Ligand binder design. Structure first.
Ligand SMILES: C[S@@](=O)[C@@H]1[C@@H](N)[C@@H](O)[C@@H](O)[C@H]1O
Ligand SMILES: [Zn+2]
Length: 1016
C-alpha cells in the first residue's frame, strides 16, 4: 500500500541535515584546488585492461534573460550559437554538443527553413546534438513552486517530442544557486534516469569528494524504500567553466580553453595562456591534461570521467568551434594512441557519460551511496552565502505566485470544453504558460537580472495574466449560460476578474467598482471559481458604489454580508504621518461564497435605498494622537477616534488576538478558556558591511543582527465587523495589516522600502515556543524540511528559502507562517520566525550582474499565521528529516496560493445565466489536489485527451476524526471516456492502461498524472 512518510526514518548513506551537524565548514586553503586538497593518484590504477574513459562534453550556457533580455540575447548570441552548432556538427560527425534551454531552441527552430530543420533533426537523431533536461529554462530551485517547475519542464519537453521526437532522460542543472530535491522528485516521475548538479556549498563538495560520494542515488527525505531515487552527479569544483572542469588546478585547465588566446577578448587570470596544440607540444600538453583528468577521476568511483567543455554563451563564433574542436582532436589523437596513458578520450554527450557509468556499475565495478536532503544555502567561497536572492525583487516573486494560479485556473476552466480555433484559447494558454515558464529561469524569479530585464519579465507576465483572464472569462460565460442561449463573440469581455490581493491596495488602483443605483442599474451578477477539488467557502469582497447592498445566491436566498469602508494609506508629506483615508464614493462588501469542487457559483449584488436586512456595517476606530475627522460619504457608522492603546479582537468563534498600542500582534488566545499565548510581530532592518564584501542581488552579507525599525507613534486603524475585522498600522516602509475572519489570521504587508539604500526589512515573530535550534521551511511548495540553526555558520547561512511556509514547534505548540510569495527567512533564536520583506542594495556583489538592487516598487505580501496545539499530533521522530503541516495550515496555504477567483459580469443583463457549475463534481479528501487539469487536444481531434496531475500531500494526524469524502476519479470527470492511462507527469509517455477507465488516487506525498481519452 502507501509508504508511511512519518514514522520510519530512512536509512541513507548521506543525510544532509546529519552531515551538516557533523561537518566543520572551515575555509582552508587547499592549494591549487583552493577549496579541496592536493589530489594524489596511483599511476598504476589504469592499465591496458582498465583504461580511463573520458567524455569531453561541449556545452553553452544560455540564460533566457540576465544582463540582456531573452530577445536581445537571442539576436546577439544564441541565434549564432545554434546556427553555428548546426553547421559545425553537420560538417564534423564526431563533434558533440548538449543543449538545455528549449525556450531558445524553439525560438530558433521556428525561424529555420525546412532544409535546415531537416539538417537539425538529423544531428539530433544521430546523437551529435543532445538535449539535456529539455525544460523551457534551467529553473531556479529555491523560489520556484514545484507546479511551475513541472509546467516549464512540460512546456520544453512537449515541444521536443512534437518537433524533435526526443524526450531527455538526463538532466543538466549547472547554474541554479543551490539545489532542491524537488528536482529529482519531478524528474524521476517524468521518466528521467540521471541528473547533474553543480552549485553546492564548497564545504559539501570537499566532504563528499573525500568519500567519493559525489555520485549518489538521491531519494526524498521521507522515502524509506527508495522508489523516488534518482542517480545524481555532483560536479566537484568551483565552477562549470573550463578552468574548473578539467581537473583541480584551474591554472592548468585554463590552458585548455582555446577561446582564451587573445583574439576573442578572453584571457586566463592565472596568467598562463592556452597554446595551440602542435606536434612539438602535444606530448607535453597531453601529459598536463591527462594528469588533471586522473586527479579528477580520483574523486569518483568508476573508470568513466565527465569533462564538461563550455561556459556562458560559448560556441558562438565559427572560429571558436574550430579552435576548440581542432585542438581537442589533436589531444585525443595523441592521448588515445599512447598506451602509457591508458586513456580513451572523445567528445561525448551527457547521456553517453551516464550510460557508460551504469555499464561500469552493472559490471560490479562500483556501488553508489544513497543520499537525502537538499543543497541550500549555497556559498561559492568564504562567507558569501547566496541567501539574498531568496528575497530580491519581491514584487515579481509575488507576481509569480499570482500567475501560477491564473494559469492553473485558465487551463482548468477552459479544459471542460473543446473550443473552436476562432476562440484562440490554445494560443492564449500557450503564451501564458510560456511567459510563466520563462520566469522560472534562475535569473527570473530569483531577482538577479538587470533592471531592464526585470521589466521585460514583468511585461511578459502582465500579458500572460491578460491571456489568462481572457480564457477564464470566456470559459465562465460558456459554463454558466443555457446552451441554447449561449452566443459568444470570442473577442468580447463578458466578465472581468476582480483580485483583492494583486497588485493590491496601495500598489495599483486596478479594482473596478460595481456601480449600482436606482436610476442606472439595480443589480449585478458576480461569479466565483474554485480550482480546488473540494467544496470550499471563502469570504470574498467587491467594491460597490453604495453601502446599501445586499447579496443573494441564485436561488434568491439571502446571504449574510458585511460592508466596510475602502481605506487607503497615504504618506502625508504635510503632517509627516502615514495615515488612512476613507473613500466617500465606494465601499467594500464582503460575504461568504460557497463553491463546488473545481466549480463555479453565481451571486447577485442588489442596491436598496436603506440598510438591507442581511447586511451589517463594520465599526472603525482610528487610534492616533491629534486626530482629524474621517467622513465616509454614505457609510452609516461614524468613525471613532482614540489615543493609541492595546486592543483585543475576536471574530466568530475563532481566536482572540491582542495588539500593542503600535498595532502589532502581541498574543493569540485560541479559545475562551485557553491562555493568551505570546506571539509578537516586530519589524527590523539589516544593513550592509562598510568593510569587505557587499550584499547585492545574490548575496546576503549583513553587518550584524537586525536592528528594530524605529516606529515612532504610528497611526492604527481598527475595523470591527461580524464577518471580518482588522488592525492596520502605518509603519515606516510597511503598512502592516492583521485580518481576522474567524480562523487563523491573514497578514498583509504593503512594503515600500522607498529610498532606504543598503537596507533589508525583516518581519520577525517572537514567541515562547521552545524550538531550540530547530525550524522547518518548505521546498518548492512541495515538502517541509527540518532545518537546524548552526552557530558555526554565519547569520546569512542560516537563511533558507521560504517558498510557501515555515514553522517552529515544541512538544506542545506550533506556529506556522504560510506565504503567498517566496521570500528568505530563518529562525535565528529559539521561539523566533523571521522572513525578509524587501531589500535595497546600492552595490554590486561581484557575480557579474554589474548593478545593485535599486528598482524596488511597492509590493503587497500576504500570509496566514497559524498557532496550534500539537501535543496530540503524531509527528515524526527526532531523527526524521521531514515535517508536515496540519490540516488548518495546509488549508491556509491553499487560501493564499489558490484563492477563489472572482468575476464581475461586464454588461447590464446576463441572459441565460445559471447558478452553479460543478455541483456533481466529487469533493475529494482535503489532502488531495488536482494540481493541473489541461486539455491536450485541439477541437479537430476525433479522440479528445485531457491530462490531470494529482498530488496528495501528507497532513499530521492530530485526533480530528476523518469524515467520509468522495473518491475522485479524474478519468470520469468528462463524459464519453474511452480510455484512462497513467502517464509521466509531462503527459508524454503512457505508463499504465487503467482497468475500468478509473484513475486511482495517489499515496501521501505522491504525485501522479493521468490522461483520459474521450470519443468526440
Ligand atoms: C551567478 S552568475 O555566475 C550567473 C551566470 N553564470 C549567468 O548564467 C547568470 O545565470 C548569472 O546569474
Ligand atoms: Zn545562468
Amino acid at each position: 500500500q502507501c509508504q508511511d512518510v512519518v514514522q520510519d526514518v530512512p536509512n541513507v548513506d548521506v543525510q544532509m541535515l546529519e552531515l551538516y551537524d557533523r561537518m566543520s565548514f572551515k575555509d582552508i586553503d587547499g592549494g591549487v584546488w583552493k577549496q579541496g586538497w592536493n589530489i594524489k593518484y596511483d599511476p598504476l590504477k589504469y592499465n591496458a585492461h582498465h583504461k580511463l574513459k573520458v567524455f569531453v562534453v561541449p556545452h553553452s550556457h544560455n540564460d533566457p534573460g540576465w544582463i540582456q533580455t531573452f530577445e536581445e540575447y537571442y539576436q546577439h548570441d544564441t541565434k549564432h550559437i545554434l546556427s553555428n552548432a548546426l553547421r559545425h556538427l553537420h560538417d564534423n560527425p564526431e563533434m558533440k554538443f548538449i543543449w538545455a534551454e528549449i525556450s531558445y531552441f524553439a525560438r530558433f527552430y521556428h525561424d529555420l527553413g525546412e532544409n535546415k530543420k531537416l539538417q537539425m533533426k538529423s544531428i539530433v537523431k544521430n546523437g551529435q546534438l543532445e538535449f539535456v533536461t529539455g525544460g523551457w529554462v534551467m529553473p531556479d530551485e529555491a523560489n520556484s513552486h514545484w507546479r511551475n517547475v513541472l509546467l516549464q519542464l512540460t512546456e520544453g519537453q512537449t515541444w521536443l517530442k512534437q518537433f524533435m521526437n526526443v524526450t531527455p532522460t538526463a538532466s543538466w542543472a549547472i547554474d541554479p544557486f543551490g539545489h532542491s530535491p524537488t528536482m529529482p522528485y519531478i524528474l524521476q516521475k517524468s521518466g528521467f534516469k540521471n541528473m547533474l548538479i553543480q552549485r553546492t556549498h564548497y564545504s559539501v563538495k570537499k566532504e563528499l569528494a573525500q568519500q567519493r560520494q559525489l555520485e549518489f542515488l538521491w531519494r526524498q527525505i521521507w522515502d524509506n524504500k527508495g522508489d523516488t531515487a534518482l542517480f545524481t552527479h555532483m560536479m566537484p569544483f568551483y565552477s562549470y567553466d573550463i578552468p574548473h572542469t578539467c581537473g583541480p588546478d584551474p591554472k592548468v585547465c585554463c590552458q585548455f580553453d582555446f577561446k582564451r588566446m587573445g583574439s576573442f577578448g578572453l584571457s586566463c587570470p592565472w596568467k598562463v595562456p592556452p597554446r595551440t596544440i602542435s606536434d612539438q607540444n602535444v606530448a607535453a600538453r597531453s601529459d598536463l591534461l591527462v594528469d588533471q583528468w586522473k586527479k579528477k577521476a580520483e574523486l569518483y568511483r568508476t573508470n568513466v570521467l565527465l569533462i564538461p567543455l563550455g561556459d556562458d554563451f560559448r560556441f558562438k563564433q565559427n572560429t571558436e568551434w574550430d579552435v576548440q574542436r581542432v585542438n581537442y582532436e589533436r589531444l585525443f589523437e595523441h592521448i588515445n594512441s599512447q598506451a602509457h596513458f591508458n586513456v580513451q578520450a572523445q567528445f561525448g554527450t551527457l547521456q553517453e557519460y551516464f550510460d557508460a557509468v551504469h555499464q561500469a556499475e552493472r559490471a560490479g565495478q562500483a556501488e553508489f551511496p544513497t543520499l537525502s536532503g537538499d543543497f541550500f544555502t549555497y556559498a561559492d567561497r568564504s562567507d558569501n552565502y547566496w541567501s539574498g536572492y531568496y528575497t530580491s525583487r519581491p514584487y515579481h516573486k509575488r507576481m509569480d505566485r499570482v500567475l501560477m494560479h491564473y494559469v492553473r485556473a485558465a487551463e482548468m476552466l477552459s479544459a471542460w470544453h473543446s473550443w473552436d480555433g476562432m476562440a484562440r484559447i490554445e494560443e492564449r494558454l500557450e503564451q501564458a504558460r510560456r511567459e510563466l515558464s520563462l520566469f522560472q529561469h534562475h535569473d527570473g524569479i530569483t531577482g538577479t537580472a538587470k533592471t531592464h530585464v526585470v521589466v521585460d519579465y514583468e511585461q511578459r507576465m502582465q500579458e500572460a495574466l491578460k491571456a489568462c483572464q481572457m480564457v477564464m472569462q470566456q470559459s465562465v460565460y460558456r459554463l454558466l449560460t443555457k446552451p441554447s442561449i449561449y452566443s459568444p463573440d470570442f473577442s468580447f469581455s463578458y466578465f472581468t476578474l476582480d483580485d483583492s490581493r494583486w497588485p493590491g491596495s496601495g500598489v495599483e488602483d486596478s479594482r473596478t467598482t460595481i456601480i449600482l443605483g436606482e436610476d442606472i442599474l439595480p443589480s449585478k451578477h458576480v461569479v466565483m471559481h474554485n480550482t480546488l477539488p473540494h467544496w470550499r467557502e471563502q469570504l470574498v469582497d467587491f467594491y460597490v458604489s453604495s453601502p446599501f447592498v445586499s447579496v443573494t445566491d441564485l436561488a434568491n436566498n439571502p446571504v449574510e454580508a458585511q460592508v466596510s469602508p475602502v481605506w487607503s494609506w497615504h504618506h502625508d508629506t504635510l503632517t509627516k504621518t502615514i495615515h488612512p483615508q476613507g473613500s466617500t464614493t465606494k465601499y467594500r462588501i464582503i460575504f461568504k461564497a460557497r463553491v463546488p469542487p473545481m466549480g463555479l457559483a453565481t451571486y447577485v449584488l442588489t442596491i436598496s435605498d436603506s440598510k438591507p436586512e442581511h447586511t451589517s456595517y463594520a465599526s472603525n476606530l482610528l487610534l492616533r494622537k491629534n486626530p482629524t475627522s474621517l467622513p465616509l460619504g454614505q457609510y452609516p457608522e461614524d468613525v471613532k477616534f482614540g489615543d493609541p492603546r492595546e486592543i483585543s479582537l475576536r471574530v466568530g468563534n475563532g481566536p482572540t488576538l491582542a495588539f500593542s498600542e503600535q498595532g502589532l500582534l502581541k498574543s493569540i488566545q485560541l479559545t475562551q478558556d485557553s491562555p493568551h499565548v505570546p506571539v509578537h510581530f516586530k519589524f527590523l532592518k539589516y544593513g550592509v558591511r562598510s568593510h569587505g564584501d557587499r550584499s547585492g542581488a545574490y548575496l546576503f552579507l549583513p553587518n550584524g543582527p537586525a536592528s528594530p525599525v524605529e516606529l515612532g507613534q504610528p497611526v492604527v486603524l481598527v475595523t470591527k465587523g461580524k464577518l471580518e475585522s482588522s488592525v492596520s498600522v502605518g509603519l515606516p516602509s510597511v503598512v502592516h495589516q492583521t485580518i481576522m475572519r474567524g480562523g487563523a489570521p491573514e497578514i498583509r504587508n504593503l512594503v515600500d522600502i522607498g529610498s532606504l539604500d543598503n537596507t533589508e526589512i525583516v518581519m520577525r515573530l517572537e514567541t515562547h515556543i521552545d524550538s531550540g535550534d530547530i525550524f522547518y521551511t518548505d521546498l518548492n511548495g512541495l515538502q517541509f524540511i527540518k532545518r537546524r540553526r548552526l552557530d558555526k555558520l554565519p547569520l546569512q547561512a542560516n537563511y533558507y528559502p521560504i517558498p510557501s511556509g515555515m514553522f517552529i514547534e515544541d512538544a506542545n505548540t506550533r506556529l506556522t507562517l504560510l506565504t503567498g510569495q517566496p521570500l528568505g527567512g530563518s529562525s535565528l533564536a529559539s521561539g523566533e520566525l523571521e522572513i525578509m520583506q524587501d531589500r535595497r542594495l546600492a552595490s554590486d556583489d561581484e557575480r557579474g550582474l554589474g548593478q545593485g538592487v535599486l528598482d524596488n516598487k511597492p509590493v503587497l505580501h500576504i500570509y496566514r499565521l497559524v498557532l496550534e496545539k500539537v501535543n496530540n499530533c503524531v509527528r515524526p521522530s527526532k531523527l526524521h528529516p521531514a515535517g508536515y503541516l496540519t490540516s488548518a495550515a495546509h488549508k491556509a496555504s491553499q487560501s493564499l496560493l489558490d484563492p477563489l477567483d472572482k468575476f464581475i459580469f461586464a454588461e447590464n443583463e446576463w441572459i441565460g445565466a445559471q447558478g452553479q457549475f460543478g455541483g456533481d463534481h466529487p469533493s475529494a479528501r482535503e489532502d488531495l489536489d488536482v494540481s493541473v487539469m489541461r486539455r491536450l487536444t485541439k477541437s479537430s481531434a476525433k479522440t479528445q485527451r485531457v491530462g490531470y496531475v494529482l498530488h496528495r500531500t501528507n497532513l499530521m494526524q492530530c485526533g480530528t476524526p476523518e469524515e467520509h469524502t468522495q473518491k475522485l476519479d479524474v478519468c470520469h470527470l468528462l463524459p464519453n471516456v474511452a480510455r484512462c492511462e497513467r502517464t509521466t507527469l509531462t503527459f508524454l509517455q503512457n505508463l499504465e492502461h487503467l482497468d475500468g477507465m478509473v484513475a486511482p488516487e495517489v499515496c501521501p506525498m505522491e504525485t501522479a498524472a493521468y490522461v483520459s481519452s474521450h470519443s468526440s
